[model samples]
Target: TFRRLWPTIAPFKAGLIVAGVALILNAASDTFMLSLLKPLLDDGFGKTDRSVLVWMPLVVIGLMILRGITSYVSSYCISWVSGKVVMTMRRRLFGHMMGMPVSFFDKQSTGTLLSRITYDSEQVASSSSGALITVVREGASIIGLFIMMFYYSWQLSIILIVLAPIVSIAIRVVSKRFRNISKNMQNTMGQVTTSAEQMLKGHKEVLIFGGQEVETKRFDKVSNRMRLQGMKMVSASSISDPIIQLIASLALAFVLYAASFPSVMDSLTAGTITVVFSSMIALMRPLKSLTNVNAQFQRGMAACQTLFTILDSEQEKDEGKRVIERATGDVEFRNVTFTYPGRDVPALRNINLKIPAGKTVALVGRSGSGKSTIASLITRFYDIDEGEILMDGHDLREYTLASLRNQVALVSQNVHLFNDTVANNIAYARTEQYSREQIEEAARMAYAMDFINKMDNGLDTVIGENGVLLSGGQRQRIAIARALLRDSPILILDEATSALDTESERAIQAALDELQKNRTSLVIAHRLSTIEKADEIVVVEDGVIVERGTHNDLLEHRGVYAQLHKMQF
Candidate 1:
């Protein structure tokens, strides 16, 4: 994990190296001050000279100021690196996730992914920052303190070194437990986040179903578990800390006891013993700090593993290499078969059909008869498992996915609107370059201009989330306008007017009729009569195209299409 994240620090290498040296220098300065303190107490205090005191305050203040500046530089360097690294990680992860197949998103929760990207990344930063700084600065302080202690009197230094194994054993035992608790805490947090997000996503359903009590109970369960884990972690952390401090206290008592013995005191001066005693206390912080971050180090490794796993995912393969023949809208499906992911039966099968260029065709079927699947194939939402789909004479795979999709526009039963002005939604397809005049014209043609003009901010009004402020019919008009604005040669209307009343149906139908002019269109509708004038009406059942012809011709055949139409009427 450390090796994997090493490259992310490339941009901050100069800063990290410089800050590390500066921090070590500061630690050295602190070690020097501790040694100087012994002399000040033993010599300066007994003399009580005004001249000595006058210089001491300025010198001490100077050291403090120097320490402060170095500390700032070290902090700035690490913080700058952490911020840049996290930002780059988030941007790269989000872009990669977005380009993945729709099926990937279907399999993962938004909340879980978000928690990994956000909370997990934060842990990486905190852990890395502390781990690196402690290893460098505290490492230097420990070494320097040991050197000074040995120089003061070798015997005392040897005694302290003998007792160091006690601190090491305590840390090893405590850190093992910390690692276990950290891993559990991370998973529990993910579950809690996922549950809350699911509730938020289904907020309207919960309200309508009066599932508030149920949701609260569910929330309470996760919350209780998290609280227990949190308390357990805190309890473990709290104990280890005091126990380590108690060990240091025992070591301190040993120093006091040995110094009191005349056999030890006879060799060491008061000043040297004072410095050694002070150095031990100063060393305690760095020692404990390093010990405590062991769990954090393990967590950082786990996070890095998770992050690399996401980065290693292979994007969907697109075999298409050729430019789409500028479609004259001749769409053909020859023995096309499709089975959804992890499904046994095909959603569409043996679907042989063709629609002539510059014509309107409709597929009228009962629910779950592959009408939507056929429309989706034309738009290339999913590739067929069997047979070829062709636009004009070119196979669908011959055209790049983007190119094929760019040439077709769809208006479905449900309208999706961004939280933006109505005018913006109409021209949403014209992202790179758009003329204001062209946008206004598109809105006018779809009959959306009238409702848009009534808004207080008109074309500039910021719609509520998903255009919740707009009426259903108004929302439908905006979607139609967006499709019309694209002005593609191939159009798909997936039960476009299925949700509307009679009055709205007529108005939207007129708008759709104008958009359909001279364009090849595939309309899927439950209302059998709306498609009576279609050039072809294909009847689909249980994944097969059973019948095809104009409405009158199919009615004359008294086939499945006739029976379905009869049932609907």
Candidate 2:
């Protein structure tokens, strides 16, 4: 795990080294201060010379000043590096997600991904910086104090050698347990986030359906599990800490007894015994700190594993070398077949269709008859399982995905609006490419000018989240204006006018009638009237194009289109 995360923190190499050196010096300062007990007791305690007292006090003040400066430097350096790691990690994770295949998002919930970037990343940062700082600083203190112990009396320090193996053995067992509990805790945290997110997503539906109790129970289960999991970690951490202190206490008792014996007392002065006793007591704190930090290190390891899973997932592949400036707007499906991820049944099968340039082709069918899937296939949102799609005689897969999509403009009933100005939403990302006059012209053509002008700021009006403040018809017009402003060679209208009232639909239909002439259009609609004037009408059923013909011809033939028309009108 350290190997995997090394590169993330590697950019701040100089800071880490400086912080480490500062921490070691800080540890040495503490060790040096404890050793002063020897000189103070042996000389200054009784009839000390005036110089001995004066020099000792002056040295203590100087060491304290040194310790304060080094402590601040290490603390600040660790924080700065941890902040950089989190910023870099979040950006990399978000960037990786953007390039991932649509199927990747289909497999993971929004809440789980958000939690990983927000909560898990935070845990990793704390572990990477805070826990590591604790380890380095505390480890140095323990080692330095032991050196002091040995310098004073080798026999008393021998007790530390026996005590080291016992503490390590306990840590080995507890460390493994911490890892298991932390992994479970991270999973449970994701569930808790998911539960809260689901409520936010479905708030209106929950209220209308009176699902309050169901949701309450849902949140409680995950919340309670997280609480218990956290308690387990704390218990393990807290218990291991006192045991380390107990070991230190027992060793201290033995040191005091062994030093008091007449044989040892003859050689051991008050000052020498004082240094060993002080050093042993000081070691307890660092030992306890090391034990506590292991839990955080384990949690960080688990967090990294969770985040890396998304990073390593396969991204969208664009193997095509061909790029086009603008297509001639010809599209064909040659036995194209596609099935959504995790579904056995094909959403589309052996589909064959040809949309000529500058003409309108319409597909009408029942809701799940695979009509909409055809639009997604043309845009290559999901690659086909069988056969190929073509644009301008070249395969769609042969053209770069960006170039292929640039030729098309889509307006569906599922409108996606950003929380920006109405003008920005209509122009989308092409603010520089499109003039304000052109945006206004598109709005006029889509019959959006009337409602937009009434908004507080007209074209510059800011839409609330997803245009929630607008009426259903107004939202539909915003999408229509966006599609109109797109000015692409091919256009897709998937239930484009479904949200509008009949009056608005009629007006927008009249506008679109003339616009459809200069481009290739594929219209998918439940309302048959919208496509009655189409150049060609195709009826799909159960992933098959059952019938195809002009409207007048299909009606005369008394087939599926005629049957659907009869039911609609």
Candidate 3:
């Protein structure tokens, strides 16, 4: 895992090297301070010369100044590097996620993925910087302190060194618990986010249905789990330090006992004993810090593993070498069979249909009868399990996915408008070079210019997110205008006018009639009256075509289409 993470730091290698040098300097400062202690006690007080006193204190002050400068530089550079790493990872993760296939989103939750991007990445920053700073700087200080201690009295140094392994063993045991708790906390946090997002998005429904208690319980369950896991992590991290401190105290007591022996007392002077004790005390802090940092290190590791899973997952597959520039609007489905993932029953089966250029075909069926699935297949959102879907006499897979989608314009019952100006929403993806007049023309054709012109800023009016300021019919008009702007040869209208009242539907019907002229349109409608003038009406039942003919012709047969028309009227 460490090897894999090494490359992410490659860009910051120079900064890391500088931090490393600063770490060594900081550690050297500790040794210099301890070295000064022995000299101050032995030489300064014993001499009448004021020179020793002045120079010693001045040099100690100088050492502190140097250490402070290095410490600030090291901290700033490490923080800068950590921020850059987070930016880099977020950019790459978002880019990769955007490129992933639609199927990838189907199996994942919105909040879980969001947690990975927001919370998990934050944990990684701690690991990359905070944990790393502790390991490197504190480790260096420990080495320096040991060197000074050994130089003063090797017997006492060995006693402290022996106790060091006890701290290491305790950290190792605590780290395992920390890792498990971290993983649990991360997953629970995702659930908490998911629950909150659901409630926020559907707060209206929750209020109307009196579902507050239900949602509260759901939130409490997940959040309480998160709190418990956090407490467990705290317990593990808090317990190790005290255990290490106790061990160090025992070693200190042993050293004091040994130093008081007559033979050892004769060999070591007061200055030597004081220096050794100061060095050991300095070593204690770094060792305790290392033990405390172990939990954070484990937390970071767990987060990295979660993020790596996402980074390594397979990207969307779009291997078609052919790039289609323009299509003739001819579409055909040949013996196609499809079943959604994890479903035993097929959503589409043995379906054969043809849509000639400049023709309109209407698909009428009950909900879940595969009417919308056919449209999705034409866009190649999911590959058909059997046979093929062809566009312009070539397999849909033959054309590039982007090029294939470019040929079709879709306006569904669910209208989506960006939080942008009225004109921007209409122009959408064509905003770069689309003239204002052209966008106005498209809106005019969709019969949306009336409401748009009356808005406070007209075409430049800023619509709230998802056009919350507009009524259902008004939003639908904007969507229709967007499709009109695209002006693709192929159009898919999946209950596009379903949300409008009779007057509004009548008003937009003429604009839709004009847009469908000289275009291949596949219309799905629950209101049979709307599609009465369609070129052909195909009735679907249980993933199979039960009837196919014009509105009048199907009425004459008095079959499924006639039965549906009667039920609607």
In terms of lDDT, model 2 sits at: 0.77
Which residue ranges in model 2 land beyond 4 Å of their true spot?
1-10, 25-73, 151-154, 160-253, 266-278, 288-309, 312-314, 419-424, 450-475, 501-517, 549-569
Kindly list the per-residue Cα lDDT of model 3 for residues 1-569, writing each as its tens digit.
Answer: 45366788798889888877887787788788888888788777888997678888789889999989988988888887887887777777888898777676776557888888878887798576888788888888888877888888757667656656775676666667666766776677677677667757898898999989988897787678767766765776677577657765765677677767647544667788888778766777998889878787876877878777788788877876666766784888888887765667887887888887887888887674577777877887777678777877788877788887878887765677788888888877678868898888888777767888888888888986745488767777787888888777788878744655767787667667777876788888766655775787877775577788988898789878666877667
Higher-TM-score candidate of 2 and 3: 3
Residue 178 of model 2, lDDT score: 67
- How many clashes in candidate 1? 0
The predicted structure with the larger lDDT, 1 or 3, is 3
Which lDDT values do the candidates have, in the order given? 0.75, 0.77, 0.77
Residue pairs in clash, model 2: none
lDDT of candidate 1 over 1-569, digit per residue (tens): 45576778797788788879888977887987787776677767778575555677777888888888888888788877777777777777788886666556655557878887887777677678777788888898989998999988868887776776776677677777776776777677677778767867898988999889988898788778768777876777677677767776787687677767757455776778778778876887888877766766786867867876776686644678756635885878888887765667787886778877877788766665567678878866666778888877778877777778777888865777776766577777465467677777877887657766777777777775744477667667777888888888888887645655656677787777877876888888666655775788876775587787877888788878767777766
Cα RMSD (Å) between model 2 and the true structure? 11.5
Q: In candidate 2, where is summed lDDT lowest over 10 consecutive residues?
A: 496-505
Per-residue CA lDDT of model 2 for 74-143, tens digit only, reads 9898888887887788889999988876777776567888888888887788777878788899999989
Ranking by TM-score: 3, 1, 2
